[PDB]
Amino acid sequence: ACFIRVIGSELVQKYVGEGARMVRELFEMARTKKACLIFFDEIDAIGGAR
Amino acid sequence: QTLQSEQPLQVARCTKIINADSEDPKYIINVKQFAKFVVDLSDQVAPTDI
Amino acid sequence: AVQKVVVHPLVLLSVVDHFNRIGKVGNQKRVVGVLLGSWQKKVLDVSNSFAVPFDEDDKDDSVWFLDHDYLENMYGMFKKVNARERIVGWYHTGPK
Amino acid sequence: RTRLLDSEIKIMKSEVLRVTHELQAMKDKIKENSEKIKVNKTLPYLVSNVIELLDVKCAVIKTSTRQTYFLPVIGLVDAEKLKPGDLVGVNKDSYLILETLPTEYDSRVKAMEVDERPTEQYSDIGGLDKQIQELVEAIVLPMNHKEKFENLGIQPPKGVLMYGPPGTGKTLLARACAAQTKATFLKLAGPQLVQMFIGDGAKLVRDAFALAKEKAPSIIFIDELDAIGTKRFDSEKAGDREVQRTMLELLNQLDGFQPNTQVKVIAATNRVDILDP
Amino acid sequence: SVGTLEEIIDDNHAIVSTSVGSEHYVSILSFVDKDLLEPGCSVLLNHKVHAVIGVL
Amino acid sequence: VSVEAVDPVFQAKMLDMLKQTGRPEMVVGWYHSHPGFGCWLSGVDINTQQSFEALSERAVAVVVDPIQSVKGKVVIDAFRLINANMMVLGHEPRQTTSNLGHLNKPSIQALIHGLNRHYYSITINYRKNELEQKMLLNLHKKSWMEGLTLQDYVVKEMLELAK
Amino acid sequence: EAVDQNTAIVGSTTGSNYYVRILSTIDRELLKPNASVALHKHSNALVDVLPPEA
Amino acid sequence: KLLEHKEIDGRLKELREQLKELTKQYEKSENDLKALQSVGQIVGEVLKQLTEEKFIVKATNGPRYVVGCRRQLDKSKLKPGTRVALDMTTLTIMRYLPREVDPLVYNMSHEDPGNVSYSEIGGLSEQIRELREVIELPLTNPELFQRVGIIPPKGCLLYGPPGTGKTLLARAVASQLDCNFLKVVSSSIVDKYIGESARLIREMFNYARDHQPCIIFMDEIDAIGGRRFSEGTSADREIQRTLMELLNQMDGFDTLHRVKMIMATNRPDTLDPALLRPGRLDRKIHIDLPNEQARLDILKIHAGPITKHGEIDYEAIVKLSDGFNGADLRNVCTEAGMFAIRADHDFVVQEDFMKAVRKVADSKKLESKLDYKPV
Ligand SMILES: Nc1ncnc2c1ncn2[C@@H]1O[C@H](COP(=O)(O)OP(=O)(O)OP(O)(O)=S)[C@@H](O)[C@H]1O
Ligand SMILES: Nc1ncnc2c1ncn2[C@@H]1O[C@H](COP(=O)(O)OP(=O)(O)OP(O)(O)=S)[C@@H](O)[C@H]1O
Ligand SMILES: [Zn+2]
Fold this sequence. Notes:
It is classed as hydrolase. Keywords: 26S proteasome, ATP-dependent protease, AAA-ATPase, peptide-unfolding channel, 20S core particle, hydrolase. The entry is titled "Nucleotide-driven Triple-state Remodeling of the AAA-ATPase Channel in the Activated Human 26S Proteasome". Chains A, B: 26S proteasome regulatory subunit 7. The structure is cut from a larger assembly and holds eight protein chains of seven kinds. Helix content of chain C is 30%, strand content 22%. With 96 residues, chain C is of the alpha+beta class. With 163 residues, chain F is mostly helical. Chain F has helices spanning 8-19, 43-55, 110-114, 133-144, 158-162. Chain G is mostly beta strands and 54 residues long. Chain G has no helices and five strands. Chain G is globular and about 25 Å long. Chains D and H meet through helix 1, strand 2, strand 4, helix 5 and helix 7 of D and helix 1, helix 4, helix 6, helix 7 and helix 11 of H. Strand 3 (36-39) of chain B pairs antiparallel with strand 1 (45-46) of chain D, so a sheet runs across the interface. Zinc ion (ZN) is lined by residues 1, 34, 42, 44-45 of chain F.
């Protein structure tokens, strides 16, 4: 399968709403090629609560 | 000699498409930076997947 | 009706070349050709013109010939390639 | 019978006049079509925005190169067609208006449009009866029975909110009523609105409202409003501003001055008291 | 001239980016290898067909 | 701008209505413009060069820029594409090459001298017309020396301006 | 800037910056640091120093 | 046997209508073919006049230029700062032109829709009369304010809890004076660029300076207002410069005249004290929630065109109504119609009003903190 590595600290950018674009392009890489894996890691930095 | 045959090659600037028109191509394109243009395809295209 | 003219020397040279065209053949009297013009105000301007063939016998000064078909054809030419111009008159080379 | 034969030859004279009409029509028409061949086949057209319309029948063009041009001669359009702020297809060389474009949108707004039509019939939903009642009686009856409300004499309502526990299924009513009804349905996520640059959310929400309004049976779906809905705060040394800018864009272009009648709103949050009143 | 890569296409030419942001499908002078080329490198470009000239 | 700007029905009409004008003389080449830059040979010119040398013997180009000067510049530029088939023999023999060297004087237009691959400019003199030169001089001088030569033969505030 | 006689650097209001040459019509004192200056279209060389304006 | 007149007239009228319409088509294409060859011109503005022949202009697209007139350009017209035309090639001046409009102004100038006047709102008869006294009287009769010899107030600030109809009061003014309401929503101003918003503010203030009775209206200020920062996000710098544009040119040195600014906010506590002082915004005008008679007034305004029967204890509905809005009781009447269509009654029974009141009671058990008094 098309394994994809994602650090949970990848969403730590400078500019506002950039992690939205990051999630966008993550899943747009996910959709084209079929039957793929995406691995998140250390999802604390992605956020704990609201 | 391939390179001297590739001076008759073409520069092929890449772009982005806003939208098509109806019953005719009449393609509306901003390049990325310059402006926005009404262009028409070359006849060597797949006239569907644009 | 006409205040004055603003006439470039180019149309005068455009008379001169047809004068060269008639100095080599049997010249009975003179040249009668078309004068185009750029009429804007009551002042007048000419940018260009062209000629038309012409002969004239002198028995009752009424036998004199142009070609209005050729005239309007080349007028349509120069009107298409330049919509500024239009006819404004004529010219002759004999000073009297 | 002399006048009858005179009119019979006059019918031939009128046929000669029809031939003169044929000549001065066909010849002049094909010559002007040839000029329109010369001028109109120049298929690369720079498009632009009409700034003003002066009358001393004079149009001023701001190019999409962010630059300007005056022209005193309008071109191959009519002055009724030209309102302030139009995309006009202008030749590079002649700088003359040749077309009229139909759309001023983002392709991202185009990507928001719902064509896929999933399948959730109401038998897939169980035990949410009053909520289905509220939603259908609030949306489908201002969609099919405008005359019902208008004979009652108030208005259609403005807005339906979804909130509560995060597992109750809020996506399900969106998918279900989009599956069953056949209006122009439109989705929207929360963080997709706020952009890296300053002011693009205003553009995005305004163009979204425009695109939905031009397809008047319009059902707007909103997802995680609390991403952009925030109880705003006055403080110092810190503060994230543009979020409230996009939210105030949403609210003012949603409600207040310049009201609209054809918008239908569905929003879904997981928490409640983050939001402004 | 000097540019920067975005992607590499196998058909002897790839996509580059200019200084201000114009982008072209331009080919490689093949005596210096394309295995030297990685996404995120600075390259040598022409003015006449803007072709990829070599490795910087 | 193309070789298909030569409309053959316009060729027939234009040239025959010049035939019934003063003389049916023969075409000697062709002209164009390049107002956007410093007047060198476009791609369309070499695309139509074989068409014109199929039409004409010399088929000499005319290159111009209309934004230059008011009395001085000689902006016109003319050429002769020599064929690539004569790559064996020497390039531009020009039997004497002494008046060609007296054409060679400025080595003008460094991008055309980049385009010296099968190109060279040609001598263009501005020759006399005895039928026209003295009368153009008559026009020019005797219409600018007071117009009618009787008019101004301003004056009382240029006192203060000059002081 | 001024390199020397008959050669200077000016930044035109195209934003860019040019190695140019100066004329002997300009009196050389009117350069002091910074003058509104006049240029050419084609060659884009200095033609004239302007009075204080802009 | 004399029907040849009818046949000749038939063919001649067919050919005559055909010639009229076809030559009209050929004439339309003739005019549109004559108009093809013209070439557009360059938009520029006049910096200053250098000499009698020399003119210093700077177009918007870039650099500065020095050219002259043609023959008859009437050089006294060229005041420094007028917008003129330029040739593309020769680049000299062609024609003096009137000033720009910037159709961002037009999308918030023409786009006032219709509305009902200030009798539609109610229960807040202090502010109605007071805004009238502070705006309409120093623009209709300034001598009442000159005989006293006291400068008129310029800026008015509407504030209060959300939903008190702060928008619709200005909308009623926009159905009362109908003069030049430049209702800026003040959120669709900033787009992305550097100084574009500052130029739009200059444009609005010039346009308001010229068309002498203008009404400036900027809703939802707090997005573009802010207060100040310890220099955090970089876009906030241009935010504060865009705000200091207003802070200067509302006051400046050249004082505005008849430029009446109507302002509305959701919470006025977050404004900048640079904007909070008088002079710019003279009198703080506060709207609050309706009282019992005021709730009665709004309720009977909404209950006018509603199909019902003579049963309505308005005192009961207003009695259960407690601390509500312009739109709360509007929602009461709307949901009363909803409950009327519930079980298909075709009139509105009085119990539907109590059901809608308890629906409002369900609604406003999720909202609080409705008291933001500034300063
Ligand atoms: N009433 C119901 N009938 C049938 N299935 C249901 C019902 N409620 C929930 N489900 C199921 O549980 C899921 C709930 O949908 P979700 O995708 O979690 O919606 P949602 O994300 O909870 O909405 P949020 O998170 O509060 S915004 C669906 O996949 C259904 O299969
Ligand atoms: N007292 C009132 N009488 C009549 N109608 C009212 C009244 N209060 C509000 N309304 C109506 O309800 C609407 C509420 O307008 P709003 O948009 O709330 O004004 P606002 O300043 O935008 O308030 P916020 O702070 O933005 S929610 C108005 O447009 C009117 O249609
Ligand atoms: Zn060319």
